[PDB]
């Protein structure tokens, strides 16, 4: 960070990567923010050993998953930093227990059920997804190179 030429290049790369993609009403201007704000919270939970940052990071990731199908990218900083969170959890099995430190981490994943089904039921979301699959243009997983 104190390198006068490693910060200018970071700013230039951020600009060159943000300008061509994220300017409209797409959900990517928010997914790209949720990814880094989940990364920083996971890193704040790993060091300075605390679990509530790693519990708000799951809420942010759940708010980011329900933005667009490409929104589950915000889970990668939570999956790559899961062994270290397990290591800061298993240091409390004697103190409080593995249940009192994973129940708050499991009740946070259960906020998608309020984010999604706040106006519509389950039989409505099922029919919506069925229509969007049987009608619109969806390409399979084995054709992923089609993106590149």
Partner 1 sequence: VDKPNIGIGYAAGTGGGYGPEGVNGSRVFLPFGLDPSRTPVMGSYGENKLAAKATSAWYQLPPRTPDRPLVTVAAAGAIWYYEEDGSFNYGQSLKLQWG
Partner 2 sequence: ELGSMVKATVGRYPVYTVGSANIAALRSAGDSCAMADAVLVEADPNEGM
Partner 3 sequence: SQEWWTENLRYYYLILPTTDGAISRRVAFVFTAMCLFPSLFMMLRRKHIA
Please report the sign of the dihedral spanned by the C-alpha atoms of residue 131, residue 136, residue 142, residue 148: negative
CB of 12 to partner 2, least distance (A): 11
- Residue 143 binds partner 3 (CB under 8 A): yes
Nearer to partner 1, 48 or 143 (CB): 143
| Cα 61 to the center of its chain, rounded Å | 3
Per partner kind, with CB cut-offs from 5 to 8 A, the member of partner 3, partner 2, partner 1, none near residue 145 is partner 3
Using the rule CB under 8 A, which residue among 4, 25, 83, 142 binds partner 3?
142
CB of 19 to partner 2, least distance (A): 6
CB atoms within 10 A of CB 1: 5
**Stretch binding partner 2 (CB under 8 A), from 13-21, 48-56, 69-77, 98-106:** 13-21
Per partner kind, with CB cut-offs from 5 to 8 A, the member of partner 3, partner 1, partner 2, none near residue 16 is partner 2
- Residue 48 binds partner 1 (CB under 8 A): no
Please report, to the nearest 10 degrees, the dihedral formed by the alpha carbons of residues 47, 70, 143, 134 taken in order.
140
**Stretch binding partner 3 (CB under 8 A), from 56-64, 82-90, 99-107, 138-146:** 138-146
Nearer to partner 1, 3 or 138 (CB): 138
Structure tokens at 43: 């890193």
Q: CA-based diameter of the chain, in Å?
A: 56
Closest to 63 in 3D by CA, of 76, 54, 72, 51: 72
- Residue 141 binds partner 3 (CB under 8 A): no
Structure tokens at 137: 């243009």
DSSP reduced 3-state for 106: helix
Structure tokens at 109: 């994943």
Note the residues at the interface with partner 1 (CB under 8 A). 139, 143, 146
């Amino acid at each position: 960070a104190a390198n006068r030429v490693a910060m200018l290049t970071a700013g230039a790369t951020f600009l060159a990567a943000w300008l061509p993609f994220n300017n409209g009403l797409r959900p990517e201007p928010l997914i790209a923010f949720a990814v880094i704000t989940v990364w920083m919270l996971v890193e704040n939970s790993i060091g300075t050993r605390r679990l509530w940052p790693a519990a708000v990071a799951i809420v942010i990731a759940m708010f980011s998953v329900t933005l667009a199908p490409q929104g589950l990218i915000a889970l990668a900083p939570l999956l790559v930093g899961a062994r270290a969170i397990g290591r800061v959890v298993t240091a409390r099995r004697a103190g409080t227990g593995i249940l009192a430190s994973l129940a708050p981490l499991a009740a946070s994943v259960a906020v998608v059920f309020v984010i999604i089904f706040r106006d519509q039921t389950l039989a409505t979301v099922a029919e919506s997804v069925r229509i969007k699959y049987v009608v619109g243009p969806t390409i399979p997983w084995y054709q992923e190179f089609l993106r590149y």
